[PDB]
Structures are given as structure tokens and as C-alpha cells.
Amino acid sequence: FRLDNLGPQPGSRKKGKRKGRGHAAGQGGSCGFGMRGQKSRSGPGIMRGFEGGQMPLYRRIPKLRGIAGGMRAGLPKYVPINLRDIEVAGFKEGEEVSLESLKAKGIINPSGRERRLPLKILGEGELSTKLQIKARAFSGSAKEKLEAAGCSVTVLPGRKKYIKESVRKNLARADEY
């Protein structure tokens, strides 16, 4: 390939249409904006969502519930991982399953929250190959799948909350068998 003979494929770069350059070009004269109105005049024009003096679409509808109250919205607290992410993976019979294994394998790519939401293994899909999972807690159906596969299942306690000594005393008093 020389510097001469290079050319783009057709359809790759259309020409930008220029407006007000002749009526044979297509958008001459009023440049494709009719005759008058706010659509033809120059400026910000119309707010998108404005109904022309009518009370708008969004104001006539009541607010969504926790967003109406200002309550904090529903937020994912784990990484949802099915067993379909585990069978299609190249994990063989002897292999650990943890955070850095699923990151370094190519299943999860967590960036915005590396610190808060650990992991969770869910139920849909099967898992025939036995493994040794030391990750965070499970669903009941995924516990039925993993204990149905005969694999080493280990839940990992992540963090310990601070309990006040009178609350820890009141809870330790409740050990009445």
C-alpha cells in the first residue's frame, strides 16, 4: 500500500449536509425548519419535556416510592454469579474459587466496587465438576447444587460488626438454650 492508492470503503464516511446552500442541495432556503416558530429561530428553543404550557408528562405522574421519600435506593450487595459462569469457565477438577480466581480467570471484571460487594453464587445452571469454593454465602438452591455435586463448600465470614458492650451483654444474656 502506497500513500497514493488508499481510499475508504463506501458508506464509511458520508458527507455532512450543508444547509442553506441551494434548493437543489436539499435543505436550502429555510434550512429544513419550515417557515416560522420556535423551531426555526436561533437559540436554546424548547426545553425537552415541555408540553407547551400544559402541565408536563413527569409532573402529572407521582414519584417513585423510595425516591419520593428520599429513601436510599435498592443497591446490589454482592456479585451475582451463576453456575453457568462456572461451567463455561476453564476451571478444571482441582481449582480454588475465590475473588482473585474469578477476576484473574475472566468471569467477573469488577471496577467500581472492589471494596464492598464480595460475591454470591446463585442457582441457575448446573455444576458437574467438583471444586473447592471459599467464597461468600449462597442461596438455598445453589447450596443444593454444590452439595449435590460433592464439592468442598466453605462460606467466608467477611466483617464483624461493632456491638456495644451492653448490647453484647443483653444478647449474651439471651443464651438461655
Binding site: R48, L57, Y58, I61, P62, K63, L64, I67, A68
Partner: protein, 69 residues
């Protein structure tokens, strides 16, 4: 540079549902409820799709929420 700002007065009213369609809460519920019927008060208690006109109006007025069509 200049990011587009999410319109908050419609972000509190509209919502995406996984497949990617705008849903909304029906109007006429927090006012004069004895006057209505229980049939009306559970007809007006559910969240439904918005119709295609105002499904394509506010789709550009609320840019960062991943709605197809």
C-alpha cells in the same frame, strides 16, 4: 467537558426494568380515596408501561438509563 445532566424531575417518576422499558406509577392515588372505588384504587395502584409518544419524548430527556427502543 460538559456532561449532560440527568433530569431529576423525571428520574424520580420513570424507571427501567431489565429488558429496557420505561415503567411508571399511575396517578390519582394520594388524594380523595373514599370517593373512588376499590376497583379503581387497585387499578390505579400498579406500575405500567408508558405509551410510545412519551416513551420517545423523555428517552432523550433522561439520557443515562439504558432504554432500548
Amino acid at each position: 467537558g460538559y456532561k449532560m445532566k440527568t433530569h431529576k424531575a423525571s428520574a424520580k417518576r420513570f424507571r427501567v426494568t431489565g429488558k429496557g422499558k420505561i415503567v411508571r406509577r399511575r396517578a390519582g392515588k394520594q388524594h380523595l380515596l373514599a370517593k373512588k372505588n376499590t376497583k379503581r384504587k387497585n387499578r390505579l395502584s400498579k406500575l405500567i408501561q408508558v405509551d410510545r409518544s412519551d416513551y420517545d419524548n423523555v428517552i432523550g430527556a433522561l439520557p443515562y438509563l439504558k432504554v432500548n427502543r
